[PDB]
């Protein structure tokens, strides 16, 4: 999603549903291919040891002057009318200047944004309404003109414009926690395996201290651990190597 071919608009963002997977976020933080890396509520190094229920990478592009609007505790046109984030947004926002990718000769005017709306959106509420409404008491009957604006306007992503107008491929990684079980987690880094020596072991299921040595015990395909006759852990199958 960060290096996708084409992005969506700011009000019709492509919500990529991410679930039941892992990812080493330090690689993206040190990828040297981004313009902004700001995680709110949790650092990129702290979230590597945390799990989440659902992760939605909202794909869209905005101008350089509008990057500040995409953050918790910030208001604006896009922060209120096109894409509203919660006041307690615990996700992370990442962006990259795509002036060499999205902009073209004459300017890329495919990314649209609404200048207003009948009411402010809710957290993570998408709207794709292209209807032209009336401002005053004189009904315009569809088309704009005489006090009835057209909210949809195209972004001016030109290749020679200033940095405040250039495109930035903002990818709002919406991390949330719902009633469902946790599916997404960080990189489960491990250490080297030691055999035939007294070493303290720490598996995902159980922990303890003892000498890990091979034996003729045959665990079932689903059995990860084993206990003795006294219902006490005396054997364990390594999760990496069978």
């Amino acid at each position: 999603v960060f290096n996708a071919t084409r992005f969506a608009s700011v009000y019709a963002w492509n919500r990529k549903r991410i679930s039941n997977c892992v990812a080493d976020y330090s690689v993206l933080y040190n990828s040297a291919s981004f313009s902004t890396f700001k995680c709110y509520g949790v650092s990129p190094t702290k979230l590597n040891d945390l799990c989440f229920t659902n992760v939605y990478a909202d794909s869209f592009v905005i101008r350089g002057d509008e990057v500040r609007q995409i953050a918790p505790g910030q208001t604006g046109k896009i922060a209120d009318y096109n894409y509203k984030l919660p006041d307690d947004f615990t996700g992370c926002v990442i962006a990259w200047n795509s002036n060499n990718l999205d902009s073209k000769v004459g300017g890329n005017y495919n990314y649209l944004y609404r200048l207003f709306r009948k009411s402010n959106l809710k957290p993570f509420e998408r709207d794709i309404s292209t209807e032209i409404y009336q401002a005053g008491s004189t009904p315009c009957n569809g088309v704009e003109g005489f006090n009835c604006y057209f909210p949809l306007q195209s972004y001016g992503f030109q290749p020679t414009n200033g940095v405040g107008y250039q495109p930035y491929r903002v990818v709002v990684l919406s991390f949330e926690l719902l009633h469902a079980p946790a599916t997404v987690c960080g990189p489960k880094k491990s250490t080297n395996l030691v055999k035939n020596k007294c070493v303290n072991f720490n598996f995902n299921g159980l922990t303890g201290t003892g000498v890990l040595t091979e034996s003729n015990k045959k665990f079932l395909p689903f059995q990860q651990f084993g206990r003795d006759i006294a219902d006490t852990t005396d054997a364990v199958r390594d999760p990496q190597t069978l």
């Epitope: 569809g142 006090n147 057209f150």
Partner: antibody, heavy 117, light 112 residues
Framework: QVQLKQSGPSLVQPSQSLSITCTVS????????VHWVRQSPGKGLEWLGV???????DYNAAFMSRLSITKDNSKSQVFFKMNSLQTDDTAIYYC???????????WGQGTSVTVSS | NIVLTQSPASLAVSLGQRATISCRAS??????????LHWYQQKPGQPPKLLIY???NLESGVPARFSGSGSRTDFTLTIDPVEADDAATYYC?????????FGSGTKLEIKR
């Protein structure tokens, strides 16, 4: 990308009628309107009229009955019908793309229309 | 009637300073959530170009040095920093009441 250069008229006489052809390119004419102005005839930049997003039209209070605009989607050009032209109507005319809040984001190169017999 | 009494008539500002251009309006207001107007910049060698739509969001094509605010009737354009590319005539167009006429026109000159 957006091009709104004017052409067609060369020289008009007073008390006559002729249309200025503003060639629309770079955007859907059905999705955006086309404005029409002239380059500061005495007072500041005088707004003449605008074509709505595929509907009716609005014009200046003074040029309400004098000037008219008509769009031709088949040729991708908008015709600015002029009527009752006088010697004071000599100025450089421009057209622009209708923005979001009735704005004029992109502007054309225009053309100098001279009114003289 | 909407008498767009735009002032000043002209300016001669040096480099690195701040220029101010006011714009008055009569009607209308409270369209959807605001009552702001549009600002433009007519260079001597280029047609006008939109500066700020709704007087609170910058428009592409022009440099991002333009900003300002305004009341329901009075509006102001803040040009900061005044540079050698700001030599142009600025305008103030109505957007919520026919006719969409511009202001009187403030010609900004750069003391090069």
């Amino acid at each position: 990308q957006v091009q709104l250069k004017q052409s067609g008229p060369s020289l008009v006489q007073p008390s006559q009628s002729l249309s200025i052809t503003c060639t629309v390119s770079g955007f859907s004419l059905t999705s955006y309107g086309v404005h029409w102005v002239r380059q500061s005839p005495g007072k500041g930049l005088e707004w003449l009229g605008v074509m709505w997003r595929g509907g009716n039209t609005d014009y200046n209070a003074a040029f309400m009955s004098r000037l008219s605009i008509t769009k031709d989607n088949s040729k991708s050009q908008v015709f600015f019908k002029m009527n009752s032209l006088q010697t004071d109507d000599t100025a450089i005319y421009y057209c622009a793309k209708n923005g979001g809040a009735h704005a004029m984001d992109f502007w054309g190169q225009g053309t100098s229309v001279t009114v003289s017999s | 009637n909407i008498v767009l009494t735009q002032s000043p008539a002209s300016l001669a500002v040096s480099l690195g300073q701040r220029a101010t251009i006011s714009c008055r309006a009569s009607e209308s207001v409270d369209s959807y959530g605001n009552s702001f107007l549009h600002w433009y910049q007519q260079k001597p060698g280029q047609p006008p170009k939109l500066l700020i739509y709704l007087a609170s969001n910058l428009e592409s094509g022009v440099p991002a040095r333009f900003s300002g605010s305004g009341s329901r009737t009075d509006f102001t354009l803040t040009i900061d920093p005044v540079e050698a590319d700001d030599a142009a005539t600025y305008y103030c167009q109505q957007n919520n009441e026919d006719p969409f006429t511009f202001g009187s026109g403030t010609k900004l000159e750069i003391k090069r």
